[PDB]
Amino acid sequence: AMANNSSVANKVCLIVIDGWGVSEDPYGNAILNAQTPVMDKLCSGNWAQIEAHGLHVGLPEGLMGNSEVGHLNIGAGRVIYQDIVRINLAVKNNKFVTNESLVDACDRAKNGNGRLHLAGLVSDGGVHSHIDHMFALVKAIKELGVPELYLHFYGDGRDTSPNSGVGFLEQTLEFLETGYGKLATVVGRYYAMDRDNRWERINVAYEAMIGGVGETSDEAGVVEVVRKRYAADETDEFLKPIILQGEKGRVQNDDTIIFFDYRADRMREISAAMGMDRYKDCNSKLAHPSNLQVYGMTQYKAEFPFKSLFPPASNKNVLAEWLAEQKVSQFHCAETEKYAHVTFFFNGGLEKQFEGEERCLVPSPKVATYDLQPEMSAAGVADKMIEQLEAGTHPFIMCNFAPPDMVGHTGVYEAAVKACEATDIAIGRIYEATQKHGYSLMVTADHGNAEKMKAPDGGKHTAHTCYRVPLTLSHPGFKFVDPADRHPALCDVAPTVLAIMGLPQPAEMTGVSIVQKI
Amino acid sequence: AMANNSSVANKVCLIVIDGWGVSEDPYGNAILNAQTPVMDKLCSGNWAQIEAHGLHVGLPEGLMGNSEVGHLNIGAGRVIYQDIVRINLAVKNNKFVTNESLVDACDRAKNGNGRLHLAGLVSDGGVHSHIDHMFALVKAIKELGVPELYLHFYGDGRDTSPNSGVGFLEQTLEFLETTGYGKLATVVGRYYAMDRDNRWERINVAYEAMIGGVGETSDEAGVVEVVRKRYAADETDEFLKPIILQGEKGRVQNDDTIIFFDYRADRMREISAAMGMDRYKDCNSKLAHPSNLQVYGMTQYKAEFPFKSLFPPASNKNVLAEWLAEQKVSQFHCAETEKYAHVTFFFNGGLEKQFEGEERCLVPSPKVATYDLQPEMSAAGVADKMIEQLEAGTHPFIMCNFAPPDMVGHTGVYEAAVKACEATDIAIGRIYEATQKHGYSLMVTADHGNAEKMKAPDGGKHTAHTCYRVPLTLSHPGFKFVDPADRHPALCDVAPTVLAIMGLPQPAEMTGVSIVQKI
Numbered sequence A: 001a002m003a004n005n006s007s008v009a010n011k012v013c014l015i016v017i018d019g020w021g022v023s024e025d026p027y028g029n030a031i032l033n034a035q036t037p038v039m040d041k042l043c044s045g046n047w048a049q050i051e052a053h054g055l056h057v058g059l060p061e062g063l064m065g066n067s068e069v070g071h072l073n074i075g076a077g078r079v080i081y082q083d084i085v086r087i088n089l090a091v092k093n094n095k096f097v098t099n100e101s102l103v104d105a106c107d108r109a110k111n112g113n114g115r116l117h118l119a120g121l122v123s124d125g126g127v128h129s130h131i132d133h134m135f136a137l138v139k140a141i142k143e144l145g146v147p148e149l150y151l152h153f154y155g156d157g158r159d160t161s162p163n164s165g166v167g168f169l170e171q172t173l174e175f176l177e178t179g180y181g182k183l184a185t186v187v188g189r190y191y192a193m194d195r196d197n198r199w200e201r202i203n204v205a206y207e208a209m210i211g212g213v214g215e216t217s218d219e220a221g222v223v224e225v226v227r228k229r230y231a232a233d234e235t236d237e238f239l240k241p242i243i244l245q246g247e248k249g250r251v252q253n254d255d256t257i258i259f260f261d262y263r264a265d266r267m268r269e270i271s272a273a274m275g276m277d278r279y280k281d282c283n284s285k286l287a288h289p290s291n292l293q294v295y296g297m298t299q300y301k302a303e304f305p306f307k308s309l310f311p312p313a314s315n316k317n318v319l320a321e322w323l324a325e326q327k328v329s330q331f332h333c334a335e336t337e338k339y340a341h342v343t344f345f346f347n348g349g350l351e352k353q354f355e356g357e358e359r360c361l362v363p364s365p366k367v368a369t370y371d372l373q374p375e376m377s378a379a380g381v382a383d384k385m386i387e388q389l390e391a392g393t394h395p396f397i398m399c400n401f402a403p404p405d406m407v408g409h410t411g412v413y414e415a416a417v418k419a420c421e422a423t424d425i426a427i428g429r430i431y432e433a434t435q436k437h438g439y440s441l442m443v444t445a446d447h448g449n450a451e452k453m454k455a456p457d458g459g460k461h462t463a464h465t466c467y468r469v470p471l472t473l474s475h476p477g478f479k480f481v482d483p484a485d486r487h488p489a490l491c492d493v494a495p496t497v498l499a500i501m502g503l504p505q506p507a508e509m510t511g512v513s514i515v516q517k518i
Numbered sequence B: 001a002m003a004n005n006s007s008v009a010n011k012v013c014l015i016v017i018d019g020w021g022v023s024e025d026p027y028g029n030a031i032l033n034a035q036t037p038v039m040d041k042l043c044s045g046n047w048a049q050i051e052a053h054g055l056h057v058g059l060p061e062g063l064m065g066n067s068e069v070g071h072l073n074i075g076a077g078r079v080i081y082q083d084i085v086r087i088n089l090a091v092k093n094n095k096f097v098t099n100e101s102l103v104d105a106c107d108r109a110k111n112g113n114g115r116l117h118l119a120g121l122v123s124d125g126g127v128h129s130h131i132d133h134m135f136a137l138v139k140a141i142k143e144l145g146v147p148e149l150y151l152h153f154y155g156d157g158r159d160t161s162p163n164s165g166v167g168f169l170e171q172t173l174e175f176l177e178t179t180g181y182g183k184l185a186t187v188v189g190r191y192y193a194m195d196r197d198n199r200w201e202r203i204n205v206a207y208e209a210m211i212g213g214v215g216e217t218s219d220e221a222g223v224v225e226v227v228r229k230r231y232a233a234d235e236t237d238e239f240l241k242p243i244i245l246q247g248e249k250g251r252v253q254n255d256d257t258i259i260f261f262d263y264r265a266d267r268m269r270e271i272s273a274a275m276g277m278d279r280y281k282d283c284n285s286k287l288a289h290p291s292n293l294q295v296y297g298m299t300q301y302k303a304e305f306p307f308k309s310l311f312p313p314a315s316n317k318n319v320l321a322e323w324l325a326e327q328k329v330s331q332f333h334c335a336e337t338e339k340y341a342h343v344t345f346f347f348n349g350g351l352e353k354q355f356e357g358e359e360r361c362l363v364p365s366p367k368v369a370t371y372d373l374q375p376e377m378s379a380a381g382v383a384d385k386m387i388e389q390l391e392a393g394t395h396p397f398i399m400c401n402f403a404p405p406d407m408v409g410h411t412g413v414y415e416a417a418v419k420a421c422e423a424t425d426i427a428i429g430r431i432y433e434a435t436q437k438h439g440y441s442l443m444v445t446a447d448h449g450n451a452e453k454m455k456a457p458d459g460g461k462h463t464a465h466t467c468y469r470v471p472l473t474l475s476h477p478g479f480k481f482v483d484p485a486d487r488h489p490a491l492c493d494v495a496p497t498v499l500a501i502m503g504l505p506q507p508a509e510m511t512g513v514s515i516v517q518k519i
């Protein structure tokens, strides 16, 4: 128990059903078709339906939700953005020109020797990078007034077929006359983007960038150089270096460099060769430049000192942390299959247990597949939550219910039906104890699943869905309201909890409470 | 980092493959049939095959392993038993006579009014209890010299047939006259004694039979005839209304002591709480509640109860993670999401505690509907993180789990299971190469089998774990495997062996043995 447990206005019990979405279509919908009298009552009158997929939860548009994202967003009281979504939003919304690390890098160049470099995979493959990110960067760098910009083009031959490079090269050249920036290197990813510690490969790109070791060319003719490579059966992935500009186009002493790939695994070696001691591993006859600073689109290794344009989200003052800071104790409970989700992920994506936080794990059943015991261990989770309600120790308690997602993944419709009936029973037992012991009950889900067990052709559908999830509230003194500018979403669950409890909301929660007092 | 990291003789990398068993049968064997050159080499020459099922890992005889049992036993360096196994062993090896809580209860009776009660379900059902356990308690209590012992018989009709109770009753009566000691005091159906839905009006019937003799009077000579008459009236074992023997002397009285012998908690919480706490209020009984009772349970029924238990939960002190921290040696635990709990909560002894110097790493599992769509799962990422720790050299003990063989094995797709095992072997190869570059000894084991048996005999899918042995490998050529003196080697021997290789002391709580020998 924590010192301020008494100051709380309302004690709250939060049930996160796993894989329970709202769909009015009955075909293969195990939730609609199950006997679910408890949720039928809670999901009536004052209840909301909130988004748990796509950009509402920080995922690419149209992509289904999942347990890790779902619990992260539920616990955070804000949208947790996947890296790609963050960068594409920055491009769409012209946010690079005020990006803290990009501004820092351009200030560095401006107060120094004026020289900046851009390096990465240049194609529309979208696995490691996108040319659109490089274009957005060039435009921002120009607007920020950097004197000299050079581009190092790593040719793509795996994510964009082996003969498209000549087109991305032509596109880049045409782009640059913008009227700003100069192409300095072309080399295949086989050399620049090795991830198997074959530093003799890395050395070709390192020497190309530092020393101009390669075939000399200029903007005029560079496409013909590449065509000559194609005719000799040397494709994009494997292009040996082509050198444009002269020493001025090389990565020199005091220069600043930005890698624009957002996937770390194939950038660790080249970035480390430029900005740390791995140049020693290259065995280059060239001298390593002094006083370089390297920036990455994202964090490539925690051990690296490089600043990142989009570093890992700090995720400060998630609900669990804020309650501890407010001196309010809490309880998190799940069975084994979702135990990590209510702990590691619910608490912001890190291994941390906060002062006053008590955790409880219920063993999952030992069966080959969960359709053989569709009720799983929902009953035992219910037992532990009822025990906490009778104690009354913790003003905020929460649990996860596993059956709908885990049985949903089997594709067995009748098993999913039994799973939803057992889950509804457990919810009813918790609800009756909340009403006897003075807790307000909120039921949600992290994403849907069991409401869609059949594909259109009548076969199994074993995946999560994009349907909305419920949000219920037993307290009669509140009414659900929508946000001003967007649909309600999981980021709004935690702000709302705090409102009911009568606690302050931290600035870091950019979600909003979606209830009003009445 | 930690202060004695440099004192270790050998740094150890422990890989726990999930669901990788040893079977020579090629039929449906995705492990054997997959291309696995790395594990084929590690599992040659000096290597061992160790047990991961049944009593070797604390489970009932013949029962397959699972990830919680396996990671518990691997982490603990001892057999982590299941309540049932512990009690059955105690009966076989005459250990009730020296059970600490049983002796406490018998000393209480002996120093007090001399009166002790046994209460539970009397049948061979084996779900909630076993009559063999009750007989063993009678024999031990007699040997301990308790003056008076009374038995309260809850009739079984759910875990055994509805008209079998007369046999268990006859058996019990003959048994008591074989011990010249102990008296049957009550017969009442589990419908009353063993409710688990808070129907306190049912609990009260049993409570009043035990406390005040509310029921039908009988004696040893008559009880069988009474029960048979119940049967003729369509009242079977589960629903027997109370039968009262010995009169008041057989009742639960002031200052009496009572032992419940069921090992399953869910149906004992109500009657035991009625006797030993405040739920007698809920019974609304006409009888006064007795003063100064003491209640003992076969096992712990609820943490909130003050009751001593004959077999309380394992303390699990000085598991490997705690012991390494106590020796001021740092450590690293890594897994992907599906097995992250197993390398943390379970590996460390079944609790939420992170010890000083322990660094943890969770690798996201792939977001696919079912894992046969990406059978390599995230084995490569786990390997990337282990290789980063091996290059750093910070932690003298590092360990990881590889999920694919178990999780893909559960899909029953043979070719996907094969791909899972090939990816697992590749990841192992990359780790092995890192341990040789950076001066670690490599040990590979598994928590139980799965993928070595993907097809049932009829050609259908086999999605379950198995009872096959698992490997234990060691790259250090200074040691040879040696079997234990008195049993097959098992998962409980993995942790002691690690310590032996690292040159560290072994805590007394690790009752496993190192199964290597210095050369």
Ligand SMILES: [Cl-]
Pocket (backbone or CB within 6 Å): none
């Ligand atoms: Cl790739």
Ligand SMILES: [Cl-]
Pocket (backbone or CB within 6 Å): A313, A314, A315, A316, A508
């Ligand atoms: Cl933040």
Ligand SMILES: [Cl-]
Pocket (backbone or CB within 6 Å): none
């Ligand atoms: Cl039962």
Ligand SMILES: [Cl-]
Pocket (backbone or CB within 6 Å): B314, B315, B316, B317, B509
């Ligand atoms: Cl112990």
Ligand SMILES: [Mn+2]
Pocket (backbone or CB within 6 Å): A067, A405, A406, A409, A464
């Ligand atoms: Mn799922």
Ligand SMILES: [Mn+2]
Pocket (backbone or CB within 6 Å): B066, B067, B406, B407, B410, B465
């Ligand atoms: Mn398994």
Ligand SMILES: [Zn+2]
Pocket (backbone or CB within 6 Å): A018, A019, A066, A067, A068, A070, A405, A446, A447
């Ligand atoms: Zn989920």
Ligand SMILES: [Zn+2]
Pocket (backbone or CB within 6 Å): B018, B019, B066, B067, B068, B070, B406, B447, B448
């Ligand atoms: Zn396992």
